[PDB]
Amino acid sequence: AGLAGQSRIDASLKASLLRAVVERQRALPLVLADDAAIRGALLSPDRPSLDRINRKLEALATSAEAAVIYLIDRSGVAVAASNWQEPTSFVGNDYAFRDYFRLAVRDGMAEHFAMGTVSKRPGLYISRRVDGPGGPLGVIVAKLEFDGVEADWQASGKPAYVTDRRGIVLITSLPSWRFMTTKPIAEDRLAPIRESLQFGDAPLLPLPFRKIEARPDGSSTLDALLPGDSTAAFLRVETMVPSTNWRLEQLSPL
Amino acid sequence: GLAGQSRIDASLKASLLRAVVERQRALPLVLADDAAIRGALLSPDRPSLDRINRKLEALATSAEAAVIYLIDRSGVAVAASNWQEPTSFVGNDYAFRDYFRLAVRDGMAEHFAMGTVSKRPGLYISRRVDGPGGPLGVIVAKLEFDGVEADWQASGKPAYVTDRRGIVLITSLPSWRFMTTKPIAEDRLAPIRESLQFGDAPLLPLPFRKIEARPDGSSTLDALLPGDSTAAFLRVETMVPSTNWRLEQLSPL
Ligand SMILES: [Sr+2]
Ligand SMILES: [Sr+2]
Ligand SMILES: [Sr+2]
Missing domain, CATH: 3.30.450.20 (PAS domain)
Incomplete structure (x- = not known):
């Protein structure tokens, strides 16, 4: 109940951090795509041009x-x-x-x-x-x-991960949960998803959860197998990451 | 316990602040070498500055x-x-x-x-x-910083950010703004006020009684109230990464 309310606040922050991290990078193509020196490098790909775009991008990527x-x-x-x-x-x-x-x-x-x-x-x-x-x-x-966001999350003491609309885990504070799923996929569209992810080895197996009991919260309890140590009991809350089509889920230990 | 978890939460506050700051740093970063912006400064004309006005207007919204x-x-x-x-x-x-x-x-x-x-x-x-x-x-x-501050309000653990003279710049508790954490001076009281463009500075100390340090680095603390009373609070400190700012968080007992 109040573990649930505290976990909602925590998952909401994690979502704002992630939103803030994404939005930093979003501005750069937004602005570069209309830049007459980017266009001219593409209209006239000489070696002087491309060296300048090279240093332009180099310095932009470093501070960004x-x-x-x-x-x-x-x-x-x-x-x-x-x-x-x-x-x-x-x-x-x-x-x-x-x-x-x-x-x-x-x-x-x-x-x-x-x-x-x-x-x-x-x-x-x-x-x-x-x-x-x-x-x-x-x-x-x-x-x-997303390595820095993943480290912040892992220091929080409450594992968190982000799914797309396919249910695949993309961002995760638990490394070996990457490309695990919120729903069983698989077999017929493993190939096309592995292709999409550029990752033949994407496990694409369901997250190690069971004993799932929904609450009137909209949250649920849950037993998960940890990258081993064993299995522990958790409260799971979810929230949308604003300005994305992504879903953050967070586990709080009971 | 509460100390461990208050440190966790304080790092997260600082980390959300760094990311919000970094998001905005990206704006002058990409714009400083923007060919349209350069062009407008070399050869200012009327249609070209209108384009820049409208461009910076749409960026201010998205950013x-x-x-x-x-x-x-x-x-x-x-x-x-x-x-x-x-x-x-x-x-x-x-x-x-x-x-x-x-x-x-x-x-x-x-x-x-x-x-x-x-x-x-x-x-x-x-x-x-x-x-x-x-x-x-x-x-x-x-x-x-209203969205960072509103984010800190929802936390339930109040937080404020100081410059290296100790002056509160960013706070989840809006009345505590420009209050002081460090002892200040005299020959520095006007130099700081002009610097902040805030001519009528507090520099009042924060309402804290019986400060009690721990082996933590943390602190026991009695503080009231912008509205309310006294309360025992645990205080923690973390430096805001990618800045020269300092964050402090108050945890109720
Ligand atoms: Sr997205
Ligand atoms: Sr000035
Ligand atoms: Sr700073």
């Missing part, structure tokens, strides 16, 4: 604490990247068939959660179409990672 | 900034998100604001103050706009 920010031309090729001096530079890479690229071309913008193709680091890929004359010029992408 | 504004090389504001308001900053002279001058010197500045007309406190976050051999201007976003 964005994993990568990069610019993709109309054929899917990354022409500029914040990580241009790193062995792991994205410059030259082909992302023509990436969701974040393809849906930004089609819709104007997209936000997509997936594992990095070489990094194996999960994150939100936030993308915007760069509009030109007579058509699209390319896409600007910022990848956000 | 949840109180105000976003562009200042020229001289210190005069040339565009603002509040440009349709009778309170428009366009035409004001900010040449002597720390956020203007320190941004020209360092590339970057932040300063917490009361607004000149608005008497509303906030963090002014600024960045130099660079041109071919020289500064072209400064972009400023003002951040105000």
Whole structure:
């Protein structure tokens, strides 16, 4: 009852923190997608241009604490990247068939959660179409990672995780709960979801919960198996993360 | 117990504050090198500043900034998100604001103050706009903290944030604002008031009796009331990451 009321307040904060973290990164493609020096680098991809966009993105990503920010031309090729001096530079890479690229071309913008193709680091890929004359010029992408939010949550003493509308856990204070589910999926649409996540190894098995008893709260009690130690008893509350289509759930130990 | 958990909750408050602050820092960061903003400063014309007025207006809304504004090389504001308001900053002279001058010197500045007309406190976050051999201007976003404060109200554990002289800048209990936590001085009482643009400073101490330290770092404490009485409270302290601010939280027994 009052564990329930205290857990509601706690889950609401965690949701505002996450909202604040996302919104920091959102502003950068919002602004970059209309920038005449980004457009001109895509209308005339000379080596002087692209070096400046390279340093522009490099310095922007560093102060923004964005994993990568990069610019993709109309054929899917990354022409500029914040990580241009790193062995792991994205410059030259082909992302023509990436969701974040393809849906930004089609819709104007997209936000997509997936594992990095070489990094194996999960994150939100936030993308915007760069509009030109007579058509699209390319896409600007910022990848956000959530390691600092996940550490804040794990220090809270109340495990928390975020699901999409498919029920898949994307962000979690318990690492091995990532890509576990709130509902049984699986078998026929494991392939398409693993493809979507860029992660063949996504377990996509239900979260280790049982003895679920709903309350008139809208909250529920629950026995979970912890990444071992054993099983413990919890109160689960949920809340929407505002300005997202994401759902935060939080467990409080009984 | 309550000490452990009060530290957890205090870190979370500080962490929500850092993230809200960082969200706004991103605004002058992307804008400072914005080609339209640069263009408007090199070659100011009428359609180009209208586009900047409207652009900064839409950003202030999406970014949840109180105000976003562009200042020229001289210190005069040339565009603002509040440009349709009778309170428009366009035409004001900010040449002597720390956020203007320190941004020209360092590339970057932040300063917490009361607004000149608005008497509303906030963090002014600024960045130099660079041109071919020289500064072209400064972009400023003002951040105000009502949503962070309203978030701290729902907690049930009151909290306030101090600068390194001990002055309360941000509080879940609105009457405690600009009250003091540290002993101050004399030759510093006017320097601080001009700095905050708050001419009639308290610097009253917070209403605390019988302060009792723990091996924690924490503190036992008797405090009343903006409305209400005395209460025993546990106090904890954490530094706000990515800032030079300090947070304090009061936990009822
Ligand atoms: Sr979302
Ligand atoms: Sr000043
Ligand atoms: Sr600060």
